[PDB]
């Protein structure tokens, strides 16, 4: 039911290098649809889903103008954290940001997000009331206090409930059908020798979208579920995903086992076994 827009931004210190690398990447429903990168020859926000190709040159310039601003924001915060943490210059440091809004089932704002991370650790987050902050540690206090005193939260609150909400609607209108799309898994089972009378039957799911899936091995009243070997879901690199489930098995008694595949795409669940 829900839907969301989110922006992921990173800034990385570069030793001496008067400027740090800055990256921003936007997601609608976990799909990447815009990206801005400091290191580009001519850096600007750049479409990364088909449906962003409509937005005229007015939009890309404004969104680019914004990144220019964020760059400085991060160049400075990055420098302020050095001090909070007693870190010197000539080091590599990372600042990351996650921000955006969630729409509920009945197309109203369900909650807002603004999280920060320093060196890969939670640093500071706006709470759900979008007025008050959670700071991760002592050092985060120095920022919590400063932000409380500036009432910085009011500004994010406005974005989260205003602009964020309205643009998500806008993109969801331009990319509705594209986002709902399914690619159904294509399955098959392989047979590999293992040792004295054991065998490996692995069950492949290939070519599917989105990543979320479920693979199950059964004898009958499907038992074991301790010994099943699993791989994390992996991107084929073409837009599709992959995944596999294996079990170790007595020889001859080969066909009492049955892999089962489950995915939004499927007209019906997949059912298969060796051969």
């Amino acid at each position: 039911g829900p839907h969301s827009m989110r922006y992921f931004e990173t800034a990385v210190s570069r030793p001496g290098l008067e400027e740090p690398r800055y990256i921003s990447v936007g997601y609608v429903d976990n799909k990447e649809f815009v990206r801005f990168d400091s290191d580009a020859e001519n850096p600007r926000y750049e479409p990364r889903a088909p449906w962003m190709e409509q937005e005229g040159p007015e939009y890309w310039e404004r969104e680019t103008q914004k990144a220019k601003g964020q760059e400085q924001w991060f160049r400075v915060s990055l420098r302020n954290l050095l001090g909070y943490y007693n870190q010197s210059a000539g080091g590599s440091h990372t600042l990351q940001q996650m921000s955006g809004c969630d729409l509920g089932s009945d197309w109203r704002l369900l909650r807002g997000y603004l999280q920060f991370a320093y060196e890969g650790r939670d640093y500071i987050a706006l709470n759900e009331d979008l007025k008050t902050w959670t700071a991760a540690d002592m050092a985060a206090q120095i920022t919590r206090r400063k932000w409380e005193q500036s009432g910085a939260a009011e500004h994010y609150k406005a974005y989260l409930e205003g602009e964020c909400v309205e643009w998500l609607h806008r993109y969801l209108k331009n990319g509705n059908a594209t986002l709902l799309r399914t690619d159904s898994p294509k399955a098959h089972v392989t047979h590999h020798p293992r040792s004295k009378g054991e065998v490996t039957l692995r069950c492949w799911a290939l070519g599917f979208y989105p990543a979320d899936i479920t693979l199950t091995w059964q004898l009958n009243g499907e038992e074991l579920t301790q010994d099943m070997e699993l791989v994390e879901t992996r991107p084929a690199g073409d837009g599709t995903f992959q995944k596999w489930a294996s079990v170790v098995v007595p020889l001859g008694k080969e066909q009492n086992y049955t892999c089962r595949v489950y995915h939004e795409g499927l007209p019906e669940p997949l059912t298969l076994r060796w051969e």
């Binding site: 926000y45 969104e63 914004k66 601003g69 964020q70 924001w73 400075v76 915060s77 954290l81 400063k146």
Partner: peptide, 9 residues
Amino acid sequence: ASNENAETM
């Protein structure tokens, strides 16, 4: 559209 941060850290 992206957001521009306010107060720095």
